[PDB]
């Protein structure tokens, strides 16, 4: 099984006490894109 | 194997109100519940309430439900098998019957009865509350004094004068000499404040190797003082 | 101190939207001790 | 409180009582589950049993839980005074909290007895440049830890100005308290010596200041 | 006070997996043009809901830069490309 | 999307509750082991020729996969007595060198996970004889005894 | 399919028996009125909608909780 | 290279050894029957783009026939009612004219390997009822005779 991590502020690693049980990824678009990314997913939180 | 640690213990008047409060190390705080108790020497060991750190479940002690009002923060997790999280407690009493000293510490199973059991316990903090303010700590030496002068033995050691609220905390060398060092606690004037004495042995050999400097260290009256206790003796055994 | 985007490899692309997600073994069968036992046939 | 304990409870080395207490019907006898404490004064307590029977772990078996139905008992055994203070008893049920006690301390008998140290210190020169004074001398390395000492100048009534303290325990077997002596500046060299006097049952030790020295 | 230790299937329990993984998506008939870069026609399709359900005071590590999806879910992406290729024209005689 | 809380509680729901509480949903974990039908289907939920794109065969070594480990899992539970019944009970004496803790210490006190973490040293010597002390030689038993 | 029947405790043998009542709105027809008048597949036909409702409980009324039991009560 | 003799005996290590001696020895093969987990590890204990060498499918097809085949047999097993049990006794008397001998003259004089070369003809006809008269109609009858 895949497992999401559920928390705003998580940063890149460490553990993540919000934590939800998915089984396949949400829709991933392969954007190929070179120093910059769009049309991805947004986290509801300030950019950390 | 889970470290729970508050903070000072010092002098507060009647009527304000001042909080304390004391925070998991080494485990998960959260799915645990909060609790505090007192051992005041006119009423002995006394319980209040508890609440729950993830979602908030209170029932206090009918003496102490109208008067305490009290929050606590949030998961800090340290890996996916410990943790730290905080819990802040406010009073409100005015009364004086519970001066004594507060602990608030927890540990158990979580599935059955015996739902709340205090286990791995805290520093317990010592609530001094008074009308009297506070007074600051001054200091001088102990003259070393013959033990055993057949083993080579001697005593020294260091002021701890009459000082509003207890406690007062005072080491020496700064913590790398624990073996042997032995200290009392305070006495109570019929006009209302402490005292107690300071002593440690040491060999009588140990003169001109070693530094011996106690520390006096009262945080309310934020003084602290350090000091060199003289190692020249005056008694004629230990003169010997 | 200066600075500057990079891109030196686009699997940052991965990272982008694949940082959620973490995949992980079934070992769903545990031992564990309890004072249950069926009928000793001797 | 409402609850009741044995107010002194007594052995020896191998022993086998432990403090028990009960209270009324609304109070932890039957249908409560009820666990108790070691609780030296000033000091964190360490917890034996927590359901009736089975305790927690770290404590080993010389401590079993058990009682009827208007009581509760813990009858510890094969005892070293490591043991020596406070056991509070304690009811609760799913949705309260629980109910502490009104005094308990273990004592036990048949012990090796243990030569009392006492160490005056005389009232240094720094002391009447304030000038208030005090002399103290205080004894520790004893047990039975219970005690009275006196104070004189010059073998003659002294009455006014001295205290002495509750005994408080932090060694690993032994006892110690505290006493000392207020002042008034002049009367004291009006002496010639001095006296911090200690009395047990078994014998009495008396340490004496010459301060012209 | 006699210890027996038994066994039970299914404990929610888990190691970290290294596997291969499988994609997704839900199909889009589109009968006008055809033939997408990486779904194509092969990727199954999403089941109408997938179910998510909250691990609750669960709290379990993520380092995403020794991740190893990633260096799959490129794997393919060079790939399939180099069959997507393979069928079409080859320009060699342009060389000129 | 918005959480809805109308289903309780699901596959590893109860990864994050103690082991009594676990012990109760072994099944929402059983069914969702094996079922690679369920989410794969045998024909598709015409230019093309044969379907070996490597999302074809790189989910065909996943299927077996799925099943081999369960299918040398519940052979193990066949070495041990327990075929279509999920817990187990047990006759070898636990000898706790391997934990020294109490029964409620570990159902109400702490999860799966968090019991395998102690012990997963201890794991492959324990199951060298929770077969032979406890099947080998419990039915040359009632070989020897259903004899007569 | 053979897990299904290790999730009802029936592994090894092919017909198994089963704890909880039907209540038959799901068939308000007799015992009799099926093995001798009807065929397998003239019955799944009709109740093929209720199927995965009753695979439900068919363990958890029935084996969830039946080994719970045993465990409480073997254990004495 | 040199023998060491710590470990006994191992998978088919009686084999050599009389019928009663490896009866006793029948789970030192159960275990390494299916268990192409243990030795072929789901990931690998980057030029190359996927996998389909043939080290890769043939290695494929061999794990399945590793379990099919056991997994037909246990289903035979499940035919004759004895799932997670190695070992079955059994109702239908034996008519010893696939073998005159004795029960001493098998288990203590010959192998398991030297049973089956002399009814191995005799082999698929006895599978047609140690179902049918032990199983096939050993459960109508709790099912008749549980029916009060
Ligand atoms: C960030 O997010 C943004 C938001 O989504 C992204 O924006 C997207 O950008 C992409 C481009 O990168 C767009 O794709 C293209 O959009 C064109 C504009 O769409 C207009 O028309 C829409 C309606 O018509 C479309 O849909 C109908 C079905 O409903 C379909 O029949 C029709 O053909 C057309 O696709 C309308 O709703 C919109 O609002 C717009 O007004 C669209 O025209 C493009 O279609 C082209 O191109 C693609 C790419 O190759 C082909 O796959 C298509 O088949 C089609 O090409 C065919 O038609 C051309 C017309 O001239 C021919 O020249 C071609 O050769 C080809 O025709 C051949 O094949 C046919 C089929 O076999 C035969 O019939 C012919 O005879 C020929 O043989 C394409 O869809 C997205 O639309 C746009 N998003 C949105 C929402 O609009 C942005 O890209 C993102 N950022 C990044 C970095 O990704
Ligand atoms: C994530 O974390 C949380 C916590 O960190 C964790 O939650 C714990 O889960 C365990 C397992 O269930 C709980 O353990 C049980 O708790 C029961 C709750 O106690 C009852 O009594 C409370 C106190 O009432 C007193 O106070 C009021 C005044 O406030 C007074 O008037 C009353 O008269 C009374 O004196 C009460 O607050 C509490 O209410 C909460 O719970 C109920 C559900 O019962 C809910 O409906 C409410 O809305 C509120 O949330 C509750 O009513 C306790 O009863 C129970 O004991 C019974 O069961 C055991 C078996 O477990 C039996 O042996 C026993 O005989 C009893 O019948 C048991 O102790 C625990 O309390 C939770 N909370 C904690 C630890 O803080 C989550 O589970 C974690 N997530 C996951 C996935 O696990
Ligand atoms: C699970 O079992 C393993 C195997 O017994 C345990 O691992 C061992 O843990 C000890 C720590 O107690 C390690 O010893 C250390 O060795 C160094 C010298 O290398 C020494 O200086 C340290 O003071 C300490 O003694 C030992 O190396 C380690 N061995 C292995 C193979 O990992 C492990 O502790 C057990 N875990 C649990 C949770 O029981
Ligand atoms: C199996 O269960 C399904 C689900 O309950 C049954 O399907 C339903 O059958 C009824 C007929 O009795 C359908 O109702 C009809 O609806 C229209 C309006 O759309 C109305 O005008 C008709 O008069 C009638 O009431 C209903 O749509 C249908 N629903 C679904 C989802 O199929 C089915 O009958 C059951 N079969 C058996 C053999 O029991
Ligand atoms: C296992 O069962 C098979 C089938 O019954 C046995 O094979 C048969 O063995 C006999 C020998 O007793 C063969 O008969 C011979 O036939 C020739 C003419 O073709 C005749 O001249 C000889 O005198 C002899 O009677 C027979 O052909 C053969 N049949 C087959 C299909 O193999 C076999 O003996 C059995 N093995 C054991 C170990 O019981
Ligand atoms: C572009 O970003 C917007 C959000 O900023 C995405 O969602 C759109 O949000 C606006 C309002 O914020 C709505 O009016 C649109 O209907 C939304 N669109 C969709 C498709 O949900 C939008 O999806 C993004 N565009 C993409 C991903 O192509
Ligand atoms: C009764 C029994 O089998 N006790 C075993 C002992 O033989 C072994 O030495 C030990 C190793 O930790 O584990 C335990
Ligand atoms: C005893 C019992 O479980 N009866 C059920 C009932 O709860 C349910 O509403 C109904 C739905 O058709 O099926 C029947
Ligand atoms: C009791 C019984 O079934 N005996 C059978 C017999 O019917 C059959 O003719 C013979 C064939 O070898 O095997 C034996
Ligand atoms: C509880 O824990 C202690 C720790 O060793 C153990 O001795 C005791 O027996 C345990 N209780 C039971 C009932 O086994």
């Known amino acids: 099984a895949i497992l999401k991590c559920k928390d705003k502020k998580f940063n890149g690693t460490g553990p993540c006490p919000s934590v939800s049980t998915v089984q396949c990824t949400h829709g991933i678009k392969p954007v190929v894109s070179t120093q910059l990314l769009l049309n991805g997913s947004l986290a509801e939180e300030e950019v950390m | 194997e889970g470290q729970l640690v508050q903070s000072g213990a010092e002098l507060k008047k009647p009527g304000a109100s001042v909080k304390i409060s004391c925070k998991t190390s080494?485990?998960?705080?959260?799915?645990?519940?909060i609790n505090w108790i007192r051992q005041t020497a006119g009423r002995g060991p006394e319980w209040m309430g508890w609440?729950?750190?993830?979602?908030?479940?209170?029932?206090?002690?009918?003496?102490?439900?109208?008067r305490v009002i009290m929050t606590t923060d949030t998961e800090v997790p340290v890996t996916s098998f410990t943790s730290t999280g905080a819990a802040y407690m406010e009073i409100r009493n005015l009364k004086f019957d519970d001066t004594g000293t507060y602990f608030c510490?927890?540990?158990?199973?979580?599935?059955?009865?015996?739902?709340?059991?205090?286990?791995?316990w805290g520093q317990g903090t010592l609530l001094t509350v008074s009308s009297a303010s506070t007074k600051g700590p001054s200091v001088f030496p102990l003259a070393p004094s013959s033990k055993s002068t057949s083993g080579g033995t001697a005593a020294l050691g260091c002021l701890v004068k009459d000082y509003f609220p207890e406690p007062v905390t005072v080491s020496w060398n700064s913590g790398a000499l624990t073996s042997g060092v032995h200290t009392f606690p305070a006495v109570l004037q019929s006009s209302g404040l402490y005292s107690l004495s300071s002593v440690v042995t040491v060999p009588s050999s140990s003169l001109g190797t070693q530094t011996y400097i106690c520390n006096v260290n009262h945080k309310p009256s934020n003084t602290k003082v350090d000091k060199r206790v003289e190692p020249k003796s005056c008694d004629k055994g230990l003169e010997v | 101190e200066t600075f500057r985007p990079g891109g030196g490899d686009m699997r940052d692309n991965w990272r982008s939207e694949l940082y959620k997600y973490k995949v992980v073994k079934i070992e769903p069968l545990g031992v564990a001790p309890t004072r249950c036992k069926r009928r000793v046939v001797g | 409180s409402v609850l009741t304990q044995s107010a002194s409870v007594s052995g020896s080395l191998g022993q086998s009582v432990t403090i028990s207490c009960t209270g009324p019907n609304s109070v932890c006898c039957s249908h409560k589950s009820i666990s108790w404490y070691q609780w030296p004064p000033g000091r964190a307590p360490t917890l034996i049993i927590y359901e009736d029977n089975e305790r927690a772990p770290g404590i080993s078996p010389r401590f079993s839980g058990y009682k009827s139905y208007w009581s509760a008992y813990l009858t510890i055994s094969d005892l070293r005074p490591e043991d020596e203070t406070t056991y509070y008893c304690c009811s609760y049920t799913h949705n309260s909290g629980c109910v502490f006690g009104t005094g308990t301390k273990v004592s036990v008998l048949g012990q090796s007895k243990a030569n009392p140290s006492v160490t005056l210190f005389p009232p240094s020169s720094e002391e009447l440049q304030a000038n208030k004074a005090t002399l103290v001398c205080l004894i520790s390395d004893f047990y039975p830890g219970a005690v009275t000492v006196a104070w004189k100048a010059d073998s003659s009534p002294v009455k006014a100005g001295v205290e002495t303290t509750t005994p408080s325990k932090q060694s690993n077997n032994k006892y110690a308290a505290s006493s000392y002596l207020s002042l008034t500046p002049e009367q004291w060299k009006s002496h010639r010596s001095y006296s911090c006097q200690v009395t047990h049952e078994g014998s009495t030790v008396e340490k004496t200041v010459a301060p012209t020295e | 006070e006699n210890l027996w230790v038994t066994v039970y299937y299914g404990v929610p329990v888990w190691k970290d997996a290294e596997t291969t993984l499988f994609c997704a998506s839900d199909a889009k008939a589109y009968e006008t043009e055809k033939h997408n870069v990486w779904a194509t026609h092969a990727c199954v399709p999403t089941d109408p809901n997938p179910q998510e359900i909250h691990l609750e005071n669960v709290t379990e590590e993520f380092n995403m830069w020794k991740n190893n999806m990633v260096e799959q879910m490129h794997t393919d992406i060079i790939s399939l490309w180099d069959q997507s290729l393979k069928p079409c024209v080859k320009l060699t005689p342009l060389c000129v | 999307a918005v959480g809805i809380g109308a289903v309780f509680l699901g596959f590893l729901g109860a990864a994050g509750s103690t082991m009594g509480a676990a012990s109760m949903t072994l099944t929402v974990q059983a069914r969702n082991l094996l079922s690679g039908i369920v989410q794969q289907q045998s024909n598709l939920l015409q230019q093309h020729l044969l379907k070996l794109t490597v999302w074809g065969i790189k989910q065909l070594q996943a299927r077996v996969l799925a099943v081999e480990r369960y299918l040398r899992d519940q052979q193990l539970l066949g070495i041990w007595g327990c075929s279509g019944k999920l817990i187990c009970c047990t006759n070898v004496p636990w000898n706790s060198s391997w934990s020294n803790r109490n029964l409620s210490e570990i159902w109400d006190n702490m999860t799966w996970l968090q019991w395998d973490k102690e012990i997963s040293n201890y794991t492959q010597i324990i199951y060298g004889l929770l077969e032979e002390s406890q099947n080998q030689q419990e039915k040359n038993e009632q070989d020897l005894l259903a004899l007569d | 399919d053979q897990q299904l029947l290790g999730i009802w405790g029936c592994s090894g043998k092919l017909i198994c028996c089963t704890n909880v009542p039907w209540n038959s709105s799901w068939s308000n027809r007799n015992l009799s009125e099926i093995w001798d008048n009807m065929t397998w597949l003239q019955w799944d036909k009709e109740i093929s909608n209720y199927t995965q409702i009753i695979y439900g409980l068919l363990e958890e009324s029935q084996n969830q909780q039946e080994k719970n039991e045993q465990d409480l009560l073997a254990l004495d | 290279a040199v023998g060491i003799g710590a470990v006994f005996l191992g998978f088919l290590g009686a084999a050599g050894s009389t019928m009663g001696a490896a009866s006793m020895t029948l789970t030192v093969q159960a275990r390494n029957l299916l268990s192409g987990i243990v030795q072929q590890q789901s990931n690998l204990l980057q030029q190359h783009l996927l996998k389909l060498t043939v080290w890769g499918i043939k290695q494929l097809q061999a794990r399945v026939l590793a379990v099919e085949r056991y997994l037909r047999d246990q289903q035979l097993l499940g035919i004759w009612g004895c799932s997670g049990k190695l070992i079955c006794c059994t109702n239908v008397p034996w008519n010893s004219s696939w073998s005159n001998r004795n029960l001493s003259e098998i288990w203590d004089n010959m192998t398991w390997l030297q049973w089956d070369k002399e009814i191995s003809n005799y082999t698929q006809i006895i599978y047609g009822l140690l179902e049918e008269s032990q199983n096939q109609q050993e459960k109508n009858e709790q099912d008749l005779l549980a029916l009060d």
């Open positions: 080494g485990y998960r705080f959260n799915f645990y519940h």
């Open positions: 609440i729950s750190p993830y979602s908030g479940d209170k029932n206090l002690a009918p003496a102490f439900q109208d």
């Open positions: 510490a927890k540990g158990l199973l979580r599935d059955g009865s015996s739902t709340w059991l205090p286990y791995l």
